[PDB]
Amino acid sequence: ALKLEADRLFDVKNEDGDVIGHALAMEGKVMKPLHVKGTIDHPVLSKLKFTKSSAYDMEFAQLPVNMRSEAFTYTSEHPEGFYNWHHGAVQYSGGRFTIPRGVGGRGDAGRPIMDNSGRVVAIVLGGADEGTRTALSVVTWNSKGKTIKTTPEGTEEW
């Protein structure tokens, strides 16, 4: 089990070059959180014309015909239980995605949350610490393709 995967997750760096978030190829588009003001570290992607979507903290461009294959798949069905993400397990209960306190922060905006079949279930934007856990502020689409945005009280954008 070698982890040979397509180029789907890209970096977004700041003026001096600090990774401040992520951008992903999914469902024909390259998308990244609008609040992440940096450049996509990619010779092709960084030259695209990005359409803004303030209401959802999303910014997106059309994936070059070629790359359209190297992309994630979305899924609007997320039964309660555990999910996967860069830092480990993400729990989904009570309509909320949570991670342990002190784990998320700058650099995590734009990172997907996936299931065991490898489909994206959401995209992290920020988090609000509640007790021993952190409630994430994510973007998720419903069965009818409508973009939805969940933002807990006191969410700090990452």
UniProtKB/Swiss-Prot annotation:
Residues marked Involved in dimerization of the capsid protein (site): 83, 116
Interaction with spike glycoprotein E2, as annotated region: 51-56, 143-147
Active-site residues, record numbering mapped to chain: 35 (charge relay system), 57 (charge relay system), 109 (charge relay system)
Peptidase S3 domain boundaries: 8-158
Region called Dimerization of the capsid protein, residue ranges: 79-89, 115-119
Subcellular location, record wording: Virion; Host cytoplasm; Host cell membrane; Host nucleus
Motif (Nuclear export signal): 40-50
Subunit structure: Homomultimer. Interacts with host karyopherin KPNA4; this interaction allows the nuclear import of the viral capsid protein. Interacts with spike glycoprotein E2. Interacts with host IRAK1; the interaction leads to inhibition of IRAK1-dependent signaling.
Primary role: Forms an icosahedral capsid with a T=4 symmetry composed of 240 copies of the capsid protein surrounded by a lipid membrane through which penetrate 80 spikes composed of trimers of E1-E2 heterodimers. The capsid protein binds to the viral RNA genome at a site adjacent to a ribosome binding site for viral genome translation following genome release. Possesses a protease activity that results in its autocatalytic cleavage from the nascent structural protein.
UniProt remark on domains: The very N-terminus also plays a role in the particle assembly process. The N-terminus also contains a nuclear localization signal and a supra nuclear export signal (supraNES), which is an unusually strong NES that mediates host CRM1 binding in the absence of RanGTP and thus can bind CRM1, not only in the nucleus, but also in the cytoplasm. The C-terminus functions as a protease during translation to cleave itself from the translating structural polyprotein.
Name this protein carries in UniProt: Capsid protein
Origin species: Sindbis virus
Lineage: Viruses, Riboviria, Orthornavirae, Kitrinoviricota, Alsuviricetes
